[PDB]
Design a protein around this ligand. Structure first.
Ligand SMILES: CC(C)C[C@H](N)C(=O)NS(=O)(=O)OC[C@H]1OC[C@@H](CCCn2cc(-c3cccnc3)nn2)[C@H](O)[C@@H]1O
Ligand SMILES: [Mg+2]
Ligand SMILES: [Zn+2]
Length: 844
């Protein structure tokens, strides 16, 4: 055994030993209990970053911990290959997106293997391969027949200069982020998943997820946005029926979740596309310009609530069916056509948005809810204004004194009696649009024929192979410019027809890849029935918090779709969910030629501890703030440089010890050095122990007769084992488990283990510590274990707690006062000589 710890001399040997034993290549073996630990598979963008290292180290700690506990652990990894990154690099570097993707896959796979992740590479998948996406094309065709997938016209943001469709997040002030040209709203036929058919199931099944973070479940509930409200119809006044047709001439229908406050409505609002808005804007140009502004807007969903709420009066009026008030109709920008009836009512006294809206335009406010003796102020909003739980109605006629639920039912009774309203259930959730006007994505298996219509590609002809021999130029997606691809024959009649040129939303691949891992080479279906029955669901899911809404909802949606097709048995894909934080780092810059900043990468910077310069020379740089690593401010630390400088074990240890998984991880040069220095300490501790006698049989069994010092070391040992086990299994806080082993090594360093019984306890301490740290730093622990013990580490298993080493030994002492019945004197004083161990007498 070499004296000094050298990672490059032990890490490749440890990986070859694990590969030889095939400890990570698992099968559907009914002997050992299964465990499915899954980390979110990455985009093959080129190289790993620190977020990748953090995610897959967390997954490897939990996987190796379960493997040591006797579980048949599957930890698969694949590549979320489709998407825009390959197309942008294709235009920038004049290469094909497929070749660019496959080269990144090979390089990134080498990095993951070098990190020593216990991954079953025989289950590797690449979502851009036809052997993978043929099965989502298959599920598409099956749901298209059932109507779960359907085709209708939608509105997109078209960029006329870059010649492609843009999301709202890519539109800035009505212009494209790259071209800067005004975008054009265009209606085109697109495909949709009818996810709203599963809204109630996707919402209620969240209650089954007892091992999910409360906020992830809360965020999905708000996204689905189920509400139990009331449809209300306000009759249009006879003086406001100009330009109206049909039921819009008779009434204005709205939806409200607060029908208990219907007596407090002071005005109503409609969307820009509403027929009432159209009829009132016929002779008013200010209303026309306001309708145009609402249509031209491209506010993202994450920003719809933070935009300035603006409205315009119409001069049209409607009548409240309860109290008979005549309310003016307003056109507002926060009312969305397609949500409900495209029109709402407004109660400024009990809705904060209506309060700010009414305060802006001096619209009336009518208090109809009271909570205790709290005073009501029409000029200042208070939080109790919106209380649904502890409020009673006021100024509501015969509804006064009623609580929320009974007033709700009373309003429903009155409205249904007049035929002016009825209870109604609504959801904020929209249907899932999956059509993408891009090349590098899964082709939609639809053929357009003028005789047969939109026809799904038959099951025998799947996949519809995306041609890889394409280099996109940036003048429209190539699939629309490639007749050799879209020109085909109709599979129903054999006549001239054209393939669909749009590709699938890349979230589709990430919505079912966890099932494909169970049988990645299965060519008769999405997942073999035998594999899905054995692996069931994912036991542990690890990934970034930014996927808590869309991705997880899509995966839960796809799991229930595949379940109803008879492919899988479970209702939920992920039992336990671990959401990790981001990795942040310092930023550096030199000031610009024209009053600006130019950001420098930290790896090209050297500090003094004060100022900092760049290593190539000595010209100083300005140290700026800390934030998430990104190419925006050039502060991403390449993990390959960290692996080259210190080795894989140091990287893994720093990621786990710097911050808990949920907390943000701050990059620290001083922190990485401490991690590497602790590995040097662990190596020297084992070396110096073996250099003083060699390995012995670890202490086990009756600890009677052991010294107090060695009994105290065993107590710390098995309490550390119990602490680490509860950290890996229950708390999933790994930096405290590292600190717990550090405390065990500290007490070991302070304990004389030179005697024969001492070296047996020292052997027991070291054999436990290297197994307690093996999930985090497996290379050095595997190397040290083989020096301490000849048995296979994974066959020795997770260290067991010795409960006997946790009991404390005191002596039963009797007391007597005047004949009749230091440390022992203070106890018997809290009940003057003392005979050692047996009696104590209190000479009273
Ligand atoms: C399931 C599927 C939808 C996953 C998808 N393919 C994906 O997100 N693929 S991905 O390749 O983007 O990420 C793969 C996984 O590991 C990293 C996690 C990032 C966490 C946030 N973050 C980023 C950084 C950072 C960035 C740049 C430089 N240096 C550090 N630091 N923290 C992801 O959320 C995911 O769990
Ligand atoms: Mg349960
Ligand atoms: Zn046809």
């Amino acid at each position: 055994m070499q004296e000094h710890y050298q990672p490059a001399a032990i890490e490749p040997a440890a990986q070859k030993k694990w590969d030889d034993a095939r400890i990570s290549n698992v099968s559907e073996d009914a002997s050992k209990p299964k465990y499915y630990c899954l980390s979110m598979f990455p985009y093959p963008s080129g190289k790993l970053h620190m977020g990748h290292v953090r995610n897959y180290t967390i997954g490897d700690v939990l996987s190796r911990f379960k493997l040591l506990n006797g579980f048949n652990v599957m930890q698969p990894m694949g590549w979320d290959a489709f998407g825009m990154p390959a197309e942008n690099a294709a235009m920038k570097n004049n290469v094909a997106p497929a070749a660019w993707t496959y080269d990144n896959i090979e390089y990134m796979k080498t990095q993951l293997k070098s990190l020593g992740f216990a991954v079953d590479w025989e289950r590797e998948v690449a979502t851009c391969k036809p052997e993978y996406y043929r099965w989502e094309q298959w599920l598409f065709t099956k749901l298209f027949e059932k109507g779960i997938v359907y085709r209708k016209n939608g509105t997109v943001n078209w960029d006329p200069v870059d010649q492609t469709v843009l999301a709202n997040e890519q539109v800035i002030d009505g212009r494209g982020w790259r071209s800067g040209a005004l975008i054009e709203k265009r209606e085109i036929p697109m495909y949709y998943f009818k996810i709203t058919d599963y809204a109630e199931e996707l919402l209620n099944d969240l209650d089954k997820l007892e091992h999910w973070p409360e906020q992830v479940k809360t965020m999905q509930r708000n996204w689905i946005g189920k509400s139990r409200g009331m449809t209300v119809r306000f009759a249009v006044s006879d003086d406001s029926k100009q330009g109206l047709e049909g039921d819009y001439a008779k009434f204005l229908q709205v939806y409200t979740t607060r029908p208990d406050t219907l007596m407090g409505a002071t005005y109503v609002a409609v969307a820009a596309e509403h027929p009432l808005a159209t009829a009132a804007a016929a002779d008013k140009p200010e209303l026309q310009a306001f309708i145009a502004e609402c249509k031209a807007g491209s506010v993202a969903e994450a920003d719809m609530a933070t935009m300035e709420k603006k409205g315009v009066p119409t001069g049209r009026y409607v009548v409240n069916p309860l109290n008979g008030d005549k309310l003016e109709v307003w056109i507002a920008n926060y009312v969305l056509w397609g949500y409900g009836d495209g029109a709402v009512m407004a109660v400024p006294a009990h809705d904060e948005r209506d309060f700010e809206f009414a305060a802006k335009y001096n619209l009336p406010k009518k208090q109809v809810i009271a909570v205790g003796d709290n005073a009501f102020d029409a000029n200042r909003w208070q939080e109790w204004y919106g209380d649904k739980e502890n409020g009673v109605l006021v100024n509501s006629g015969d509804l006064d004194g009623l609580d929320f639920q009974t007033a709700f039912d009373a309003v429903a009774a009155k409205l249904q009696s007049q035929g002016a309203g009825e209870p109604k259930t609504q959801y904020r959730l929209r249907d899932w649009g999956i059509s993408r006007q891009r090349y590098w994505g899964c082709p939609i298996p639809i053929v357009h024929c003028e005789k047969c219509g939109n026809v799904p590609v038959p099951a025998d002809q799947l996949p519809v192979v995306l041609p890889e021999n394409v280099v996109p130029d940036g003048m429209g997606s190539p699939l629309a410019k490639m007749p050799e691809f879209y020109e085909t024959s109709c599979p129903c009649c054999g006549g001239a027809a054209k393939r669909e040129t749009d590709t699938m939303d890349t979230f589709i691949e990430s919505s079912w890849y966890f099932f494909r891992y169970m049988s990645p080479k299965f060519s008769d279906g999405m997942v073999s029935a035998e594999s899905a029955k054995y692996w069931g669901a994912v036991d542990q899911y690890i990934g970034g918090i930014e996927h808590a809404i869309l991705h997880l909802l899509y995966a839960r949606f796809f799991t229930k779709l595949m379940r109803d097709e008879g492919l899988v048995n479970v209702d939920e894909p992920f039992e336990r969910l671990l959401t990790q934080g981001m990795v942040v780092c310092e930023t550096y810059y030199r000031e610009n030629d024209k009053g600006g900043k130019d950001w420098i990468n930290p790896a090209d910077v050297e500090l003094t501890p004060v100022s900092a310069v760049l290593k190539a020379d000595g010209l100083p740089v300005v140290i700026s703030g800390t934030e998430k690593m990104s190419k925006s401010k050039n502060n991403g630390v390449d993990p390959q440089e960290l692996i080259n400088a210190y080795g894989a074990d140091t990287a893994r240890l720093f990621m786990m010890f710097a911050a808990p998984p949920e907390q943000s991880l701050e990059w620290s040069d001083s922190g990485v050095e401490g991690a590497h220095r602790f590995l040097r300490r662990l190596w020297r501790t084992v070396y110096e122990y073996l250099k003083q006698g060699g390995a012995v049989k670890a202490f086990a069994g009756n600890q009677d007769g052991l010294s107090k010092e060695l009994k105290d070391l065993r107590h710390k040992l098995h309490s550390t084992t119990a602490k680490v086990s509860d950290d890996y299994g229950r708390r999933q806080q790994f930096n405290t488990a590292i600190a717990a082993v550090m405390e065990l090594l500290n007490q070991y360093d302070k304990t004389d283990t030179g005697s024969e019984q001492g070296r047996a306890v020292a052997q027991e301490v070291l054999e436990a510590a290297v197994r307690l740290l093996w999930p985090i730093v497996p290379h050095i622990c595997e190397t040290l274990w083989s020096e301490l013990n000849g048995a296979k580490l994974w066959e020795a298993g997770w260290p067991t707690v010795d409960e006997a080493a946790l009991v404390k030994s005191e002596i039963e002492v009797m007391v007597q006062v005047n004949g009749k019945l230091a440390d022992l004197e203070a106890a018997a004083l809290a009940n003057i000589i003392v005979v050692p161990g047996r009696l104590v007498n209190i000479v009273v």
